[PDB]
Design a protein around this ligand. Structure first.
Ligand code: NI
Ligand code: NI
Lengths: 620, 620
């Protein structure tokens, strides 16, 4: 079918065979990542080559390998051994989750720390946390996982309510050694439970909510063909899914009359990092790259009808590979539906006597993932007027600690003795731009204030200025909410009827960027997060802002390296990388389970059309 | 019943009778403004005293009067004659709108200007606009309206497509004299029509949109008692309606257990200003205060079921006074409904095996108004988690001009020869705070970055700092998006279970504030718009950020005068005034009719509750 169709179970199986029948797949080999590759840059590509990229880990301790197979041709295109100390470790394997707790349970240092706290080892849950890169020389080259303990009073108890502060362990997951156990001192383990389904906590449930029924008696207005191709209200796109990025949007275009006009070639959340701002050595190394290290697509939930997605929902069940190369389906992992969006346009004109009102609607493509204590909803919206928007919804259970006696400048109190370390959830949307084709350019537009005087005697004038970003070395931009700064992506060789380059304007939320000291390890490893907007020249090997192997990578791996190429981006095939995130100082209201907090960005047509593209929407 | 109930037709008729009886409402008198006053500050009130404030205009040129009557007691509490040259003219009367075009139709200077452009006077519409305060000394003390011409080719033609640039006229609407006709030169009058209902422009209407039905089989979850008292999912409030302010929310409180806890005593949009940034003399005086000068409430549309408000809607039809004191009902002028709001909270816990998902909902209270070419929707939202939000939706037809041949730094092109001068739509939300009562304070909270070194060896630490605003002189604040600046309103005498003062945090959108030069007439008249947040000590006569009389009134009233009192606001009855707006550089997509653009703000609980207030929300 389409070269952008979702990976089939058969294709995953065929990859497994190909790797097996080559000595790449076997006994101590585990697939840490597998995903289909996007078609190469071309126009008359009438020869389909479905290729898959795989990261293969070796349990014995042997060197991992990056292999690209061709499923169409049943071949191995490349297979390279990786020097992980140089290029970074492979993505954390799901099967290594339990390992940190298991190994620590027989460690005398650990057991001693628990005994001192009178904690039963069988009730101590341990979180498999990414290690990052700090001052531990012995960790370079080794696949380390750090562990923080949470007491679980019983099977259905929420362990997050009972953090064990003053203690942290480091574990080499291949040699299976507890490399270290640090105990800075005993902290009271918070006693209150955070069991949000416990009637004693919830109280009598409300009986006041009457139903809100959302139906489509004639079915939805969008069509799904070729498994993942969507056609909706002039919009056209292909919904892809990657185990690392999650939902990826391909070929977003708009049928402007006779033309199917491209806007965005590929849209994805290429990275997601959660840096913590607690200077306690128990947590100061804590930075979770949910997308890069853990792979958010891998953990997508199976969304239930009527609970997660309301109304007329069309589901996609993406297929992924397990650690052995067998295909695993994520049933109902992606929701697709259209929802009413209030008033689109309205005017009651006195002079003409015409009263006009039209309703708005948006196509929604979403999924929800669970990464330990956090749960994130990723939502992509396409609007009738041409607006494209992304929204991330952060919920789950807050990552806890003990609340220090005498307070804290970096931790807030949730319950008696229970603290919540300050942190941020920072995202990177990778937008492979295609405004009316690939010849694009980006301009930074600032509102311009004018001084009262000659030519502006009443001092009421205000303007705007646009600065073209010509080389990558000038394409690392910061927000300026004060001057209403935005960035416009245009095609200098495609003019609208008023002879102006067609374009789309990116409206950012202007939330704070990475707060960590610039010389910090996280500042270097997640350099993308220190600036709001980056523009690079497209390159098939530049996929993530943090690089291909984020786990225990030293620093400067992605964007800072690409940007260093200083390529021409003025009227070229370019990619926009927008950093946006939430800064959290958890409140009592976030405990025991946090209500959704949101962040995102949007792009609106800016002289893309010759007039409003919604004049043909009826009153119905 | 409740002293916060909406004005009834009988009450308005009684005010008329009381005024007539007092000799204050003879045949030459007109009611420019009539509204019910809120109950006085207190507790033990001795029965009801429904009072109404009225601004009385005199068509014969006599001085207007401000009068307060007690409709309950049949008395005039006060009546004072106004010196308009000093304190400001009364709001524009609806009847004076038609006067501008009518008077100009027989003016020879006007006729000559039209003849020079070959325009038929019977086809030239004149947009009657507020005058402002400029260098025209003869205007001081007179009621002036300025006029800009638009050609209307036929009865149902949209005149905005055909602006007549280079011409403007000033008219005294009382003495009925054209004071000035300015013609700076002819400009081609744009020829394309902007008729969005013309099949020739719309093209064939889409047949692709299938229905989205939203119903509530068991009715809505909120209850309406006493005409305007709403109770929904723990929230309690009274929906009032004022002709100047539009929808006003009273006594917003949350039922936390046995306690009905107040949050906001009164919330309204106390002012709106639309300044233009085109330095052409034809439009450089252009600034309307839709709320203050025109009274947005009197122009509220009657909303259509299914079109304007989709779902199970409960309408309020507010009653206002006509120019003579007779009651007039705005049928279905306010929509009240609850809408589904996606996911509220979600977590799939590995350790406990418990998968939890809850849906969100919001109570919506809204109205839409039309003032000339603009249509604005005002939306207030109450969420399950305790969040309060306001959203303004700006639509209608763009205010046009000619597009200068050699381009423009202050006007954009929409169609051939058609321009759209740059402008802003700035709002002022007046929040009379009552966080767990009237003893409140405001703190400005900035995220704090920390330097790597002693105490922060890994350079990951980040904090927050809060500065209490103690006196009015230090309560005029600006946004700082870069440092995640927010403002927290707390009650220093009411502490949550963790012994922290309860509070609510205001999250602003950090959009650009007033762009006009600080020395401009508009910067002084709309002084409130130059700053993001102001905090004043409550006073019953400090109602609007611009004063009681905005029309043709210079600086001297409003917030700048209030603030000078430098009152104590640290743990006192205080009022928060938040400026938030849209900066518009119209684009081709905004022509022929503008798709909705939005702006707003929200307040989220900040340690107000002892834990999440939505744990009792059913699975459903
Ligand atoms: Ni968080
Ligand atoms: Ni506008």
């Amino acid at each position: 079918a389409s070269p952008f169709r979702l990976a089939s179970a058969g294709e995953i199986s065929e990859v497994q065979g190909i790797l097996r029948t080559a000595g790449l797949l076997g006994p101590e080999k585990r697939i840490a990542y597998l995903g289909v590759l996007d078609p190469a840059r071309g126009a008359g590509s009438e020869a389909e080559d479905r290729r898959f990229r795989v990261f293969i880990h070796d349990v014995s301790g042997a060197r991992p390998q990056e292999v690209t197979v061709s499923v169409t041709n049943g071949t191995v295109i490349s297979a390279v051994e990786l020097d992980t100390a140089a290029t970074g470790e492979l993505p954390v394997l799901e099967e290594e989750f339990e390992v940190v707790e298991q190994l620590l349970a027989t460690d005398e240092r650990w057991l001693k720390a628990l005994a001192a706290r009178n904690l039963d080892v069988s009730k101590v849950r341990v979180a498999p946390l990414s290690a990052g890169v700090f001052e531990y020389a012995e960790e370079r080259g080794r696949r380390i996982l750090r562990g923080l303990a949470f007491v679980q009073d019983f099977p259905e108890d929420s362990a997050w309510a009972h953090p064990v502060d003053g203690l942290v362990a480091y574990v080499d997951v291949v040699s299976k050694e507890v490399t270290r156990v640090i105990d800075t001192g005993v902290f009271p383990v918070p006693a209150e439970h955070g069991n949000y389904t416990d009637p004693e906590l919830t109280g009598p449930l409300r009986t006041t909510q009457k139903p809100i029924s959302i139906t489509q008696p004639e079915g939805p207005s969008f069509t799904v063909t070729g498994g993942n191709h969507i056609e909706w209200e002039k919009w056209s796109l292909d919904v892809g899914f990657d185990v690392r990025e999650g939902v990826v949007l391909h070929n977003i275009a708009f049928r402007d009359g006779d033309r199917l006009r491209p806007i965005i070639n590929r849209a994805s959340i290429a990275e997601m990092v959660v840096p913590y701002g607690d200077p306690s050595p128990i947590r100061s190394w804590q930075n979770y790259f949910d997308t890069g290290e853990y792979l958010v697509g891998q953990y997508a939930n199976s969304l239930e009808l009527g609970c997660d997605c309301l109304g007329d929902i069309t589901y996609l069940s993406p297929v992924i590979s397990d650690a052995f190369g067998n295909p695993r389906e994520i049933r109902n992992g992606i929701c697709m539906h259209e929802e009413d969006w209030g008033i689109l346009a309205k005017h009651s004109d006195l002079w003409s006597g015409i009263n006009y009102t039209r309703r708005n609607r948006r196509m929604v493509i979403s999924f929800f993932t669970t990464i330990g204590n956090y749960d994130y909803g990723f939502y992509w919206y396409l609007y009738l007027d041409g607006t494209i928007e992304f929204e991330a919804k952060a919920t789950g259970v807050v990552f806890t600690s003990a609340f220090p006696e005498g307070g804290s400048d970096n931790i807030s109190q949730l319950a008696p003795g229970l603290g919540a370390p300050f942190h941020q959830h920072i995202f990177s949307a990778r937008l492979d731009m295609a405004i009316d084709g690939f010849t694009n350019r980006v301009e930074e537009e600032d509102v311009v204030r004018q001084t009262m005087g000659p030519g502006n005697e009443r001092g009421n004038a205000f303007s705007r200025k646009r600065t073209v970003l010509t080389r990558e070395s000038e394409a690392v931009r910061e927000a300026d909410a004060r001057t209403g700064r935005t960035w416009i992506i245009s095609n200098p060789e495609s003019k609208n009827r008023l002879n102006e380059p067609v374009g789309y304007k990116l409206h950012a939320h202007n939330q704070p960027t990475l707060l960590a000291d610039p010389g910090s390890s996280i500042a270097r490893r997640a350099a993308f997060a220190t600036k709001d907007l980056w523009v690079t020249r497209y390159a098939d090997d530049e996929r993530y802002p943090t690089g291909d192997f984020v786990n225990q990578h030293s620093g400067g791996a992605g964007l800072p390296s690409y940007i260093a190429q200083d390529r021409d981006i003025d009227g070229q095939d370019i990619v926009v990388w927008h950093t946006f995130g939430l800064t959290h100082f958890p409140r009592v209201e976030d405990w025991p389970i946090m209500p959704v907090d949101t962040v995102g960005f949007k792009l609106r047509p800016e002289g893309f059309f010759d007039r409003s593209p919604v004049l043909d929407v009826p009153a119905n």
